[PDB]
Symmetry: D2
C-alpha cells in the first residue's frame, strides 16, 4: 500500500504524540519545495519572455524563508542567503530551528545541471531569547533533516531519526509518494567523486586515495571520476550506487570551500542513518562545534569502506 510524504509525517507524528509544530514544519517544508520545482524547470517562462506584452537564487529563499516564518513552528532560521541570522517574530514563533541552503548548484544551472534544497531542523535548547547562537550546534543534535534534489526528476529525500525515506514527486497532482522505504547505503562503492581540477592544491593524502583507485593495488578495477558540480546532485547519487564524495583542504583554506551549517551536516546526517560514515578528517562532521553560522568545513562521505579505506590513507601522511 501507498504512502504520500505529507502523510507519513502525520502517522509518525501521531506515533510520537508531540506538539505538532514539527508536522506543520515538514508539510510547510514540503510545499515549499514543490513550489521551487515549478520555478526550477522555468515555470511560465512564457510570460517573462513576451507571451503577453511587457533572479532564481532568490525565490527559492523568498519562499522557504516564508514557508517557515509563516509555518509557525520556528524561532531562528539560518541560510547561505543572509550574512546575518533571521529571528522569527513574537507571534510566528516555535520551538524548532532551521539551517539550510536554498539552492546548491546555483549559477551552474544556466547549463541546467541539477540543483536541490538542503536543510537542517535542529531543536532550540534554552529559555534564553532565541538567537543566531541557537543554530551554533553540532551535527548530531540534529532532530531531523534531509534534502530535495530537482534533477532529471524531482526527488526529495527525507532524513529523520527513524532513518531516511525516498519520496519521489508525481508533479501531475501535486504530491510526493514514498518510493524507497527506509534506506541504507551499499558497502563499497566503485565510483569516487571529487573535482580533480585542483589536484595541485591537494595534500599528498588525497593524492593517493585517488591513485589507489586509478591504479588500485589488488589489481582490481578503477572507480569512476564522475562528479557533476552541485553537491546536492552528487551526494545523493552516491547514496544510490554507493561511492564517495571528497571535498577537502588546500590553498584556499584548511576548511575547504563547503559550508558546515547547511551543506554538510545535513547530508552527513543522511549517510549516517543509511549506515554511512562522514569523517571530516580528524573526526566526524556530525560532532564538530560551530563558531559562525557560515562556518566552513571539509567533508568526505560515502560508504563505510570508501572512507575507512580513505581515513586509512589520510593518516599515513600524518
Amino acid at each position: 500500500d501507498v504512502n504520500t510524504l505529507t502523510r507519513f509525517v502525520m502517522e509518525e507524528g501521531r506515533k510520537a504524540r508531540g506538539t505538532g509544530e514539527l508536522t506543520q514544519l515538514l508539510n510547510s517544508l514540503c510545499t515549499a519545495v514543490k513550489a521551487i520545482s515549478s520555478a526550477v524547470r522555468k515555470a511560465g517562462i512564457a510570460h517573462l519572455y513576451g507571451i503577453a506584452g511587457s533572479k532564481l537564487d532568490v525565490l527559492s529563499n523568498d519562499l522557504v524563508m516564508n514557508m517557515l516564518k509563516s509555518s509557525f513552528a520556528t524561532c531562528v532560521l539560518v541560510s547561505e542567503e543572509d550574512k546575518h541570522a533571521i529571528i522569527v517574530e513574537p507571534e510566528k514563533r516555535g520551538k524548532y530551528v532551521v539551517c539550510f541552503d536554498p539552492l546548491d548548484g546555483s549559477s551552474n544551472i544556466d547549463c541546467l545541471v541539477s540543483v536541490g534544497t538542503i536543510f537542517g531542523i535542529y531543536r532550540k535548547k534554552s529559555t534564553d531569547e532565541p538567537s543566531e547562537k541557537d543554530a551554533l550546534q553540532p551535527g548530531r543534535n540534529l532532530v531531523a533533516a534531509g534534502y530535495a534534489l530537482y534533477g532529471s526528476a524531482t526527488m526529495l529525500v527525507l532524513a529523520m531519526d527513524c532513518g531516511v525515506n525516498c519520496f519521489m514527486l508525481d508533479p501531475a497532482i501535486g504530491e510526493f509518494i514514498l518510493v524507497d522505504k527506509d534506506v541504507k547505503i551499499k558497502k563499497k562503492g566503485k565510483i569516487y567523486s571529487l573535482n580533480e581540477g585542483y589536484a595541485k592544491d591537494f595534500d599528498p593524502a588525497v593524492t593517493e586515495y585517488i591513485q589507489r583507485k586509478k591504479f588500485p593495488p589488488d589489481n582490481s578495477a578503477p572507480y569512476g571520476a564522475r562528479y557533476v558540480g552541485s553537491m546536492v546532485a552528487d551526494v545523493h547519487r552516491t547514496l544510490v550506487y554507493g561511492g564517495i564524495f571528497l571535498y577537502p583542504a588546500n590553498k584556499k583554506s584548511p576548511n575547504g570551500k563547503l559550508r558546515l551549517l547547511y551543506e554538510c551536516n545535513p547530508m552527513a546526517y543522511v549517510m549516517e542513518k543509511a549506515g554511512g560514515m562522514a569523517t571530516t578528517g580528524k573526526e566526524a562532521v556530525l560532532d564538530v562545534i560551530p563558531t559562525d553560522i557560515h562556518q566552513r568545513a571539509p567533508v568526505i562521505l560515502g560508504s563505510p569502506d570508501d572512507v575507512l579505506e580513505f581515513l586509512k590513507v589520510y593518516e599515513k601522511h600524518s
Copy 2:
C-alpha cells in the same frame, strides 16, 4: 518579440518555400519530446504505486518512433534500441532518415542524473528502395540535428544551415521558446570532461593533455573537472560555458564508446555550427564514414581552442 519553436521552424519554412517535410519532422518530433519530458519527472508515478490499487529507456523509444513513423517525411529511421534498420512503411514514406539516441545516459536515471535525447536528420540520396544504407550517411550531409536535455529543466537544441538556438520548455503550456539567438561557444574554455577512471588504459596523446590542465606549463590557474556521466548533459555545459569533452579510445576497442550516427555525429554538428570542432583525433567527426548503424568512435569537441591544444598534444605522440 516572443517566439515558440513551432513558429521558428515555421518561419524558416516560408523563406525556403518547400514541401513541408522538414517542418513536420521538427514539429512531429518536438512533440514526442515534451512527452518523454513528462515521462521523466515521473509524470504520474502515484498511479503505479498504490494510490488506486494495482520503463523509460523504452517508453521513450516509442514516442519518437510512432511520432516519426507518422510524420511522413521519414523513409528509414535508426535507433539506439532497434538493432537493424527500422524501415518505414510505404504509406508513411518521407525524404529524411532520422538517426536518434532516444534517452541518453538512461541506465543512470535511478539516480536522477539528467539525460537527453539525441537526433540527426539527414536525407536520402539514391533512388533504390530504403534500407540501412539510406541512413549510412556521414554527419556532414546532415541537414538537421540537435537534442533535448532532460535536466533541472528542459532545453532542446536545433542545429541546421543557419545556426544554433535553444528553446525552453515552459512546463505550464507545453511549448518551447527560443531563449538565445544563434548561440556560439567560447574560443578557449576552462573545463575538461571524460571518465578519468580509465586513466590506466588511456593512450598518451591524452595522458599529456590531462597533466596539461591540472598542471599547466605556464603557472596559470588550472581548469576544472566535471563529468555528469550521461553525455547530453555533459556536452551541453561544454556548450553554454565552453570547454572540452573527451571520450577517447583505450583498451575497450579504439572504437571507444559514444555512438556515431546518433550520439557523436549530431553533437559534433551542433558544436561545429556554434563555432567549434568535434574531432575523432585522427580527423574531424563530420567526415568519418558509416559502415554499420552501430559503429562507435571516440570524440573530443567544444571550445575550438582546447580542441586545438588537444588536437596538438596528439601528434606529439604520433
Copy 3:
C-alpha cells in the same frame, strides 16, 4: 497572510487537541481529489490515442475509496458507486464513517461539464462490528462534509463546525490555497435553478413558485433560470451569489432523485453552515432519519429569504 488546505486542517487539528484521525482522514481525501482532477482534465489522454503506442465514474470512486481505507481512520464507506456498504478491514479501521459521491456529473461529462465530489463524514456512535447501520445517519450528526469542484479551475470547499472555507488548487505545485474565508451567503438572491422541462409533474407549489418568479407579484427584477444540472456546479454557484436550488417531488417519487446520505446530507450541512437553508418541502433535510443508505429526497436550498419564501407556499398548498 497565506494558507493551504492541508495546513489549515493541521491548525484546527492542533487547536482542538484531538486524537489525530480526522486530520489524517481529510488528508487522504484531499490527495485523492488532487489525483482525480488530472483525470477529469484528461491527463494521460493522448497516451490513449497511442501517441506512444496504444471508465471514470469508477477510477475516481476507486480513488476516494482505496485512499480512504488507507487513511487509517475508517470502518464503513458508502458511495453512489458501490451497492452495499463497504466494510473496512480489521487492521486499518478507524472511528469515522464517511459517505460520498465519487463524482456527481459523471454522465453528461461528454459535454465536458463541471463536476465534483461530495462527502459526508459521520462519526460512528453505537458499538459492534461496523456495518451500514452506522452509515445510516442523518445529516446533523455530522462533523464534516462538503465538496471539491471541477470547473474553470479547481476548488475544494470545506465546511465543518467552524465554517466554510474555499481552497483553490494551483496546477503548478498541487495544493489547495484558501481563496475565501468563513464563506457565508446572501440573505436573498436573484437566481433560481431546476430541471425546467419536468413541469409536467410539478406539484402546485413548484409550478407556482416558478410563476412567482418568472412574473413577480410585486414588480421585482425577475430571477435568472441558470440550470446546469449536475449537483456540484449548480449548488456551489448558489453559495457565491445566492438564489435557490430545487429537485422536487411528483410522480418520480415523493422523494427527489438525489440520494440522501451523500448528495443532500453534505450539501445541506453546507448551505446551513453558510447562513442558508435546506428542506424536503415538508421537513428540513439534514433532520431526516435515513433508512436504506440509497434512499433519496426532494431537496430545496439556497439563500434563506428565497427558501422560506418557497417553503411558505409549500403550506399555502397544505
Copy 4:
C-alpha cells in the same frame, strides 16, 4: 493512428498549397488558447495570494492579441474588449483579419462555471488600408472559425472547410489531441437551452415552443431543460447531445443580445458546418449584413429538427 491539432493542420496545409499565414495564424492562436488554459485553472494562484512574500479578462485578451499580430498572419483585429478596432502595425502585417471573443463567461466566472473562447477568421476584403470596414463581413464570408471550451477539460472545436474537429488538452505534455474525428449534430435533440426568466419579455412565438415541449403536443418524451448562460458552455454541450439554443429578443430589444462577429457568426459557421441549423428567426445568422462591431442578434441554433420546429411556429405569430 494518432493526431495533434498542429499536425492536423500542418497536414491540411500541404494539400492546400496556399501562403501559410492561416497555419501560422491558427497555430499562434492554438498556443494562445493553451496559454490561457493554464491561466484559467489559476496557474499561479499560489503566488498572487501570498506564498512568496506579497483582472483575468484583459489577460486572456492581452494574450491572443500579442500572438495573433505576432503570427504575422493578421492585420485588422476586432475584439469584444477594445472600443473600436486594433490595426496591426505596418511591419507585423498579414491578410487574414480575425474576430474573436477573448473569453466568454467573464461575468459568471466567480462561481467558476465553464468559460471558453470562440473565434472567426475572414480573409481581408479591401486593397484599402486595414480598418474595421474591412472586418465588417457576413458570417458566411468566414474563412475559418471555431472555439475552445475550458470545461471538465480544455477542449477545442475548430470550424473550417473540411468540417469541425475536436481537441482535448493533455496539460502534462501540452498539445491538442484529435478526439472526435469530424462531427455532426443529431437530427433530433431533447434538450432546449436558454434563460427562461426573460419569459416576461418573450414574444408569443418563442414562448409557445417552450410550451409544446414543457408539455408535448404529442405526449412523447418531455424535453429536458439545461442552460449554463455561458455562450460556449452550451452551444457545445448542444453539439454533443442534440438540442436547441435560444436567446432571442426580449426587454433588451428586438435585435438580439449576443455580438455578431464573434459571439454568433463563428458559432454559426460551426453549427452549420458540423451539420445543423442556424437562424435569427429573421434569416440565416451568418448571412446577416454587418453595420458595426458589437452588433447583437436573435439566435436560435442546434439540431435541425428542433431548430426547424421553431420555424413553422415562427411564421405563425406572423
